[PDB]
Amino acid sequence: ALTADPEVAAAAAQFLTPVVHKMQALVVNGKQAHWNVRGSNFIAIHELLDSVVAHAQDYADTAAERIVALGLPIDSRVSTMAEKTSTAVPAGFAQWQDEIKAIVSDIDAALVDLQAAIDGLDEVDLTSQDVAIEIKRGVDKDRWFLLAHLA
Amino acid sequence: ADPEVAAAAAQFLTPVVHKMQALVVNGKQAHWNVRGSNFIAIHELLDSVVAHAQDYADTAAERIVALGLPIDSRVSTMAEKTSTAVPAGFAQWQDEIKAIVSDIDAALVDLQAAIDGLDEVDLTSQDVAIEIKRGVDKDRWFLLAHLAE
Amino acid sequence: ADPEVAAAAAQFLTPVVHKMQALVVNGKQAHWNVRGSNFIAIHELLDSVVAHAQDYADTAAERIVALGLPIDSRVSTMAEKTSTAVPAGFAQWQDEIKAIVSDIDAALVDLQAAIDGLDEVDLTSQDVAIEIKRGVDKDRWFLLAHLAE
Amino acid sequence: DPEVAAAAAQFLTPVVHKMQALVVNGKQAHWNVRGSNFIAIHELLDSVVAHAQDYADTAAERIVALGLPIDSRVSTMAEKTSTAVPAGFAQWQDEIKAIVSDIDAALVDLQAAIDGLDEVDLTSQDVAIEIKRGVDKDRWFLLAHLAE
Amino acid sequence: ADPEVAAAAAQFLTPVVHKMQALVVNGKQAHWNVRGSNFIAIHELLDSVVAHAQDYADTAAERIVALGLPIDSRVSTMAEKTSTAVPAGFAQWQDEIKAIVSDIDAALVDLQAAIDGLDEVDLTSQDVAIEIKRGVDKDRWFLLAHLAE
Amino acid sequence: TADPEVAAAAAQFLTPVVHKMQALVVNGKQAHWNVRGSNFIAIHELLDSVVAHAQDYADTAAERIVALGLPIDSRVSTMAEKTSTAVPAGFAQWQDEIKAIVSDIDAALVDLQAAIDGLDEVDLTSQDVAIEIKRGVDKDRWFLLAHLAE
Amino acid sequence: NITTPALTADPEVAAAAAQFLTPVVHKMQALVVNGKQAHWNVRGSNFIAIHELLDSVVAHAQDYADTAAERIVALGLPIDSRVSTMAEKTSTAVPAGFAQWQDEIKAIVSDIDAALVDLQAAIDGLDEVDLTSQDVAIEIKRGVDKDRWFLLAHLAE
Amino acid sequence: PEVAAAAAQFLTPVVHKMQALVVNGKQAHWNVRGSNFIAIHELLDSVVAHAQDYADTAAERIVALGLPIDSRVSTMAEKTSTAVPAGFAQWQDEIKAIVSDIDAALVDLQAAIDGLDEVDLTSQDVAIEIKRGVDKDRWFLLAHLAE
Amino acid sequence: DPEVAAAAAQFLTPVVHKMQALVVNGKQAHWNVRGSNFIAIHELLDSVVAHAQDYADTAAERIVALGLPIDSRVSTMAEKTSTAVPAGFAQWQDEIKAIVSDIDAALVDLQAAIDGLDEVDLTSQDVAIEIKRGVDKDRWFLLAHLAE
Amino acid sequence: TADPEVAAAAAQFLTPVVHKMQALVVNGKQAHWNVRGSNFIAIHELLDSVVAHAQDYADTAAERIVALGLPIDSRVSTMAEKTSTAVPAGFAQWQDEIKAIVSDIDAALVDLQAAIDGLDEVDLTSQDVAIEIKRGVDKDRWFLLAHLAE
Amino acid sequence: TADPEVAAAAAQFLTPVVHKMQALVVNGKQAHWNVRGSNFIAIHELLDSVVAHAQDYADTAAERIVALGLPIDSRVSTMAEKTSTAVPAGFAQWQDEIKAIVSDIDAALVDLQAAIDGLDEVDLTSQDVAIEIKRGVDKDRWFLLAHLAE
Amino acid sequence: DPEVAAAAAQFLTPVVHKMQALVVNGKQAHWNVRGSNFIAIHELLDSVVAHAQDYADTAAERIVALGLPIDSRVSTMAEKTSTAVPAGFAQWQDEIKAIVSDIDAALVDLQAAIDGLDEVDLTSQDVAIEIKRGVDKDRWFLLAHLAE
Ligand SMILES: [Fe+3]
Ligand SMILES: [Fe+3]
């Protein structure tokens, strides 16, 4: 996809690439939490986590395709993703409160990156900014549904 | 209940979870970055490879957990245990297919070991491995038939 | 037919029909009577268990009938052949879960014996028992996961 | 008082037992039915079973919503119900007569629930009236086959 | 017509409209502000209670309008005729359940009054109240079972 | 982590949106039930869709507030203090129902436009919620109003 | 052979259903035919809204005829709703050709009014006799009362 | 007016007979008895839903061309007759009675196809489509008596 | 014989142009219609547009299926068609009359196709017949509103 | 190394299954069109369901052989050479169509059991394919034959 | 009382169409399973759609014959005597699968046109069946052949 | 402020015209496309067409909802619009290139709308941004085919 302004494409890649890596990692780590969660709220949190993962897969895809449509590649191979990301999700079985605290922590780091994209794209490309804004609304809502459980 | 039955099954199935889950991530990579004369049909087919891979990853991982054992499928553990030929950047559809087929071949090696090895251990977990192997053998053919020429 | 092939399946699949269909009735009982902080999630979870049990009971019974033998699964015969831990009246969700898992664990013994017993005799009926065991093992995990810690 | 909750359980409890028993004995007929009408009757019996399970759930939960438990364990249900459904294979005409006989007994309980709840609780009465409309229709779909 | 039939419908169903419509708004209040260990299940359950209450308000109101009489359920009038135990802000789920159960109990008084009052007047409008009462009694149990023991 | 000031300022802009939208649900139903006249079925139906949109908008705005970590007071008593309606008490011709609901919508549009201008310097994510609500509300207003054009 | 289960299990309750629901079936079934006539022939400024609203009134009337008829038959007595009988037992204000939508509405409401009289008589006559059949009449009266309002509201005020 | 007139001449009998078939097929559906009850009760409902569609299609064809249709119950009854029994009947007899009503409708359908042929091929297509469906329905019914 | 394809192209091409034009001009009437019947007519015109797009597709694909190109570019379509749809806001009665006038012109061409394909290609003729059935019905749905 | 015997065995054991399932589609359609008598609608529909299942089993078996890298010859001419039907050439009573279809099914079950036996030692993934087809076909058989238990 | 000529003409002109469409299901599946090369997935899928359409057309044309009171013989053995295919025995490139399929479709179209012309004086209802099948087959043929336009 | 509605009409009007023209020229390309990618490109063009028709409706109804008419008659649309889509049969690479060219022109107008609405009306700006996001994506799906 060409195109007209290499500066617009370069800004989208710069601000949206970290969003892709963190959303795609949240699919893999969210799956881990969903399989390994235990305790009194299992079925609800098991299912809430699968929701979060479905959302994160869709956000990863939207952000990535926005980049590619502007004519730049994205490297989101597993090795790259793992170099660029970190998770607090436990290695094995864990009580639901603890999986929520871990997922909320990964969500918090994605939000830092989404907010950086919103500010960064504001004077360069409002169309790519809108992608980060839409992702941010969905993630802020997921974060509330997770965290409401701990209050 | 024999805990070595569950542990042995987890040992056969864990590589399948790691490889299927990496196939989801690396297939998305190929789905985003593919170019060339067959773009739309391959971009769509890779997405359906990915959706199958995610299901197979879920089926295998929840067999392990149903057997009572945890599964370490964190991003960090997955990268340590898997490797991909999917290119880093834009690539022609033939090259994307070849690389996804190579990742699949390595998954089929672990599925065949799981099928052989579960035969003496746990037939219900064997069946999970056969079911994933049927589906994966079919994706492999859909991909490879494009290069037959 | 081979007269033994049919007789082996009635013998191994019959107790699965009886326990699966008893699990529909006692599942409903738990579903109606369950109380406490997790009511809505467990009320629905149990409904899902009942729906699976009903499907599994049909699949096993219809496999037996397809091979040409009758099945006696009247209320009276089922009560003779089955037992339940589900309480008579209101009970906290933890206790409903333990009671149903107990009932499942008994079904699992009969499924595993059908899997072992069908192995050199009728692989088509063995597949029925395997397919039912997979779903029952998963329903047991969803129930049991609630009681960890 | 609610002696009003107690009346629901008295009049609706029989309904839960007979409907729930109809799910099991209905499935028995469905599996074991034979002969020239197999597929229409096998299907129709599966439809009667689905209805029965719904009615059992509606009656039971009406009782629980009022505050009283229900004992519908397999043992209690067997003690309080009887079936004419044959132990094994049987012609479609015989399965019908057996099932209609099981329906006729439930209908007796539903009518006693309608009459009994009339001066006590119209909301529970309405549950038994709803179930009786469905069970009356099921009985006709079955029995019209033998009309002949 | 006989104008006393429409008049008794409006007299006994109007409070059902006001309290069902109020339960939609105050239900949404509790749905948004609910907090604690059971959040997702209770947040969803309350949304279902709100959807039922909206349907019930509609059914009762259209029965009145179909008999030829108007209904005043503007916000101002509905606020004069109803009150709520739902808190102004964030609250634990046990407290939201108790507040909403309180509101349901007042609507139940009015439903039973309609059922009794419409019995020698209009059995078609009586049936509308009976249908709403069946749904509200079930909703009430779903909420209240979470608090039991 | 994240500026409580931003959240607090955003809740202030969105809170009137929630009260006005939730009131349009109740007032719109009022109009839906009591509307009369030659256009009854079309307008009775349009009002139902207006009510269903309004309820979604109330839910999106309120959920945005709570996602920012703040409570929302939308009890009936509070909503009645902060809102008023032109919808008649009883039976009304469809022309009069449209003019009343348009007047209620117009007042919502004032709060919406204030959210949009004010959130531009506070939170663009919250501002997008208000923009999405105003696009739908604007459209609903035209569908109502086009009827009176002649 | 045989003979066995009775087909008409309660002949007095059967007879009450047939006595009170038969007129319901004939008028509901007639409403389907005459509703379609109005649906086809309606003209004027409200054409499309009215054309469609008449189509739902027709679909309701068909389902109510079916519910009423199958209640009678389930209880064990036949129903004669052949075209010749329904025509003897029913009449319509619906015009023979094209008619403006207000006049179609008035005609349909007049046919619904005659149906409502039969439904109220059924609700009253089944009251001490068969509450299950009564419930069928109540359910139909609720939906017919609502369709009457939808039609009639158009002519207010 | 010529095409409108031809449409009215040929499709009007189709409307009357299809709408009658709805009412008389409903009668057969309620009152059918016998070893084949469920399959025939359900098959008769499907014939009734087709007949209602066919009436609606033929009727709107006439009206779209500018002529009214009188399909009130009194007019339909004056123009149609049925062999459907007044009460309970065995399914073999409901099928013979319904196939009789259908044979009558087929004669009017074929007349409409022959008569619209020099006049209006678009109205003629309505008659053909109805006939295809009604021939199929007649076969589903009649196959049951083939032995 | 290449003259089957040529006849279809000859009789179906004006049908594609007028149906495609009706999508655009009907969208125009859809956006700009005002007055007491707004929502009903705004919806009805969307439905006319959806049908017209389908008719255009069916006719054009019949031509291409027979082996011949179709020139339905905007520029060509505009040379070949005219509309009475007003430039701006108009009352619903006026939108209906202007769309009925564009439909009447489409009917002249459909009828010429039906007559012209009669001795040549009954399969292409069936395409014209099917489109004409649907457009005759649309015209009535519009016009009935003005009967009074 | 890779192993060709796994593929050749699948083709050996699954190919009769493809041809017999595919011929059942065509002969089952024949019985479906030409069936007559007291049970016509129920049998006519039943047979359509058996044909839908048979088409699925053919596809499943074929694509298994293809996925393993080997071609399948299932042209009409080849299929006709390798298969045979008891279905009558013209109209037949439903009891006779049922007997003819059950006979075609019985022959296909012989090949499925040979495939299940033959694949046990060689390729359990393909064996599974045959087991799944056999469960469906065994059940189709019963639904048909139950009508003759009379 | 029914004209024996109407039935006989429909059997005469529609029976070849049933044989050719039913064969196209079988040979189309063969092409679907065995196709290869750069357009695999798009043609694999396009062939399944042509197979489904061919099955629907087979059904429609056969049911028209039986509705008129005549049986039809579409057993595998008869269908094979009466049809032939160019679809290859094994793996083939997608260009050659398209060409083969088009060739089978061209043979069906000559029979469709013969039905349309021959039913014109006898039975317009049966001619309509042939007309409808021909519109769909002419479209399938275009979708296949346009790939070879380069 | 009627300067708002006037801004939306100024900036959104070229969007309505070029999207609506893309429907007609997109159908032309979809009908006439040929070559080794026929079915995938035939289907992709139908999807671009369906998006374009929705983008046109969204932009036009934004203008109308603000209280201004829109002239999108065929004749006005043709005056304001140009296509590079060939008159007849063309290879899929040429149709892609022609359509992409038509999409590039729409994107200039979309960008002018985004930039021009920024200080006037953020609600109409958002319409243009949403349209631009979908149009950028469709352009990529088309153009990725030509990367070799
Ligand atoms: Fe999972
Ligand atoms: Fe919400």
Tokens of H97: 């009675």
Tokens of E149: 């023991």
Cβ atoms within 10 A of the Cβ of J66, count?
Answer: 22
| G41-G42-G48 Cα angle (round to 5) | 125
- Phi-psi region for residue H66, left (φ > 0), alpha (ψ -120 to 50) or beta? left
- Which of 1.20.1260.10, 1.10.1740.10, 3.30.70.20, 1.10.3720.10 would CATH assign to domain A1-151? 1.20.1260.10
For chain A, helix, strand, coil in percent to 5 are 75, 5, 20
Largest CA distance in chain B: 56
C-alpha radius of gyration, chain B, whole number: 16
d(CA B26, CA B99): 10
Q: Hey, what amino acid is at E28?
A: K
Cβ–Cβ under 8 Å, residues K2 and K60: no
Structure resolution in Å? Answer: 2.0
Residues with CB under 5 A from ligand 1 (ion): B 58
**Chains linked to B by 3 or more Cβ pairs within 8 Å:** A, C, J, K, L
Q: Hey, what amino acid is at I135?
A: V
End-to-end CA distance of chain D: 51
Residue A41: which residues within 8 A CB-CB, separation 6 or more?
A96, A149, C38, C41, E37, E38
Distance F63 CA to ligand 2 centre (A): 7
Fold assignment, C1-149 = Ferritin (1.20.1260)
Strands F35-36 and I33-34, by their bridges, are unpaired
Cβ–Cβ under 8 Å, residues L91 and L35: yes
Helix (H, G, I), strand (E, B) or coil at H47: helix
Cβ–Cβ under 8 Å, residues B114 and B16: yes
d(CA K145, CA K50): 13
d(CA B68, CA B66): 5
- Phi-psi region for residue D70, left (φ > 0), alpha (ψ -120 to 50) or beta? beta
Cβ distance I145 to G100 less than 8 Å, yes or no, reads no
Chain E residues touching residue D126 (CB < 8 angstroms): 127, 130-131, 134
Tokens of G31: 């409403």
Residue I84: which residues within 8 A CB-CB, separation 6 or more?
I97, I98, I101, I102
Closest CB from C75, C76, C89 relative to D71 = C89
Helix then strand count (H, E) for chain B reads 5, 2
Cβ–Cβ under 8 Å, residues I21 and I85: no
Cα–Cα distance list, G39 to D142, G14, G31, G43 (Å): 38, 36, 11, 9
Length of chain A equals 151
Cβ–Cβ under 8 Å, residues F16 and F111: yes
Cβ–Cβ under 8 Å, residues G58 and G111: no
Tokens of D146: 């033998």
Handedness of CA L63, L64, L69, L71 (dihedral sign): positive
* Residues pairing with B70 in the sheet: none
d(CA E69, CA E63): 9
Strands B34-35 and D33-34, by their bridges, are unpaired
d(CA C59, CA C111): 13
Cα–Cα distance list, B1 to B11, C106, F147 (Å): 17, 13, 74
Cβ–Cβ under 8 Å, residues G36 and G107: no
Handedness of CA A37, A40, A46, A49 (dihedral sign): negative
Q: In terms of DSSP H, where are the helices of J35-75?
A: 40-67
Is H29 marked within a binding site? Answer: yes
d(CA B61, CA J110): 37
**Chains linked to L by 3 or more Cβ pairs within 8 Å:** A, B, F, I, K
Nearest Cα of chain A lies from the Cα of B75 at a distance, in angstroms, of 6
Cβ–Cβ under 8 Å, residues E109 and E82: no
d(CA C121, CA C8): 8
Q: Which residues of I are annotated as a binding site for Fe(3+)?
A: 30, 57, 61
Tokens of K13: 């002109």
Tokens of F13: 């802009």
In this structure, the dihedral spanned by the alpha carbons of residues L72, L77, L81 and L87, taken in order and rounded to 10 degrees, is 130
Closest CB from D97, D101, D143 relative to G7 = D143
Helix (H, G, I), strand (E, B) or coil at I40: helix
Mutate to test the interface with J, among K24, K68, K76, K85 (most CBs of J within 10 A): K76
d(CA A121, CA L129): 14
d(CA D103, CA D119): 26
Exposure of I82 in the CB half-sphere (CA atoms within 13 A): 2
- H or E element: which one contains G76? none
Strands I90-91 and J35-36, by their bridges, are unpaired
Nearest to L40 by CA among K41, G7, D129, E54: K41
Q: Which residues of L are annotated as a binding site?
A: 30, 57, 61
Ramachandran angles phi, psi of C12, nearest 5°: -90, -30
Strands I90-91 and D33-34, by their bridges, are unpaired
Deposited experimental method:
X-ray
Tokens of K133: 């099948």
Tokens of J46: 């039943």
d(CA K37, CA B49): 19
Residue D97: which residues within 8 A CB-CB, separation 6 or more?
D84, D146, G2, G4, G5
Cβ–Cβ under 8 Å, residues I59 and I126: no
Cβ–Cβ under 8 Å, residues E50 and E10: no
| G3-G7-G12 Cα angle (round to 5) | 125
Whether domain D1-148 has CATH 3.40.50.720 = no
Tokens of A84: 């660029």
Residue L117: which residues within 8 A CB-CB, separation 6 or more?
L7, L8, L11, L124, L125, L128
Cβ atoms within 10 A of the Cβ of B122, count?
Answer: 22
Helix (H, G, I), strand (E, B) or coil at L63: helix
Tokens of D32: 């074991």
Cα–Cα distance list, F25 to F45, F105, F134 (Å): 14, 11, 16
d(CA H20, CA H40): 19
Nearest to D59 by CA among D22, D97, D98: D22
| I132-I135-I141 Cα angle (round to 5) | 145
Nearest to B50 by CA among B38, B60, B58: B58
Distance C32 CA to ligand 2 centre (A): 28
Ramachandran angles phi, psi of H63, nearest 5°: -65, -45
d(CA K70, CA K66): 5
* Residues pairing with C34 in the sheet: C91
Exposure of K98 in the CB half-sphere (CA atoms within 13 A): 26
- What is the per-residue DSSP string for chain K? ---HHHHHHHHHHHHHHHHHHHHHHHHHHHHHHHEESTTHHHHHHHHHHHHHHHHHHHHHHHHHHHHTT------HHHHHHH----S-SS-EEHHHHHHHHHHHHHHHHHHHHHHHHHHTTT-HHHHHHHHHHHHHHHHHHHHHHGGGG-
| Residue found by looking up tokens 């007519």 in the block | I41
- H or E element: which one contains H81? none
Handedness of CA C59, C65, C70, C74 (dihedral sign): positive
Cβ distance J116 to C128 less than 8 Å, yes or no, reads no
Cα–Cα distance list, F99 to E18, F35, F106, L61 (Å): 24, 12, 10, 21
Handedness of CA J115, J121, J126, J131 (dihedral sign): positive
Cα–Cα distance list, L74 to B91, I82, I84, I86, L101 (Å): 43, 8, 11, 11, 21
Q: Hey, what amino acid is at F146?
A: A
Nearest to G87 by CA among G29, G39, G37, G36: G29
User: Nearest ligand to the C-alpha of residue F55?
Assistant: 2
Tokens of J26: 């065509």
| Residue found by looking up tokens 């959807």 in the block | E51
Cα–Cα distance list, C117 to C73, C131, D108, H127, I146 (Å): 21, 15, 46, 65, 79
Tokens of I27: 């969208």
Strands L90-91 and L33-34, by their bridges, are parallel
Handedness of CA H55, H61, H64, H65 (dihedral sign): negative
C-alpha radius of gyration, chain A, whole number: 16
Helix (H, G, I), strand (E, B) or coil at D34: strand
C-alpha radius of gyration, chain F, whole number: 16
- Which of 1.20.1260.10, 1.10.1380.10, 1.20.1540.10, 3.40.50.620 would CATH assign to domain G1-157? 1.20.1260.10
Give the start-to-end residue ranges of the domains of chain G.
1-157
Nearest to C66 by CA among C132, C122, C114, C110: C122
Distance B51 CA to ligand 2 centre (A): 29
**CATH architecture under which domain H1-147 falls:** Up-down Bundle (1.20)
Nearest Cα of chain E lies from the Cα of D13 at a distance, in angstroms, of 17
Nearest Cα of chain C lies from the Cα of E94 at a distance, in angstroms, of 9
Helix (H, G, I), strand (E, B) or coil at A90: coil
Task: Name the residue in chain B with its Cα closest to that of K93.
Answer: B149
Tokens of H90: 């065995």
- Which of 1.20.1560.10, 3.40.190.10, 1.20.1260.10, 3.30.1490.190 would CATH assign to domain K1-150? 1.20.1260.10
Q: Hey, what amino acid is at A149?
A: H
d(CA G93, CA G109): 9
Chains D and L touch (3+ CB pairs under 8 A): no
End-to-end CA distance of chain H: 49
Distance E39 CA to ligand 2 centre (A): 12
Tokens of D82: 């009887």
Nearest to C57 by CA among C113, C132, C126: C132
Nearest Cα of chain F lies from the Cα of E3 at a distance, in angstroms, of 17
Nearest Cα of chain H lies from the Cα of J150 at a distance, in angstroms, of 13
Q: DSSP E strands: which ranges in E37-82? A: none
d(CA I22, CA I53): 8
Cβ atoms within 10 A of the Cβ of G127, count?
Answer: 12
Residue F138: which residues within 8 A CB-CB, separation 6 or more?
F109, L62, L65, L66, L123
Cβ atoms within 10 A of the Cβ of J150, count?
Answer: 12
Chains G and F touch (3+ CB pairs under 8 A): yes
Chains E and L touch (3+ CB pairs under 8 A): no
d(CA B128, CA B121): 13
d(CA K63, CA H143): 12
| DSSP 8-class letter at H50 | H
Cβ–Cβ under 8 Å, residues H142 and K67: no
User: Nearest ligand to the C-alpha of residue A43?
Assistant: 1
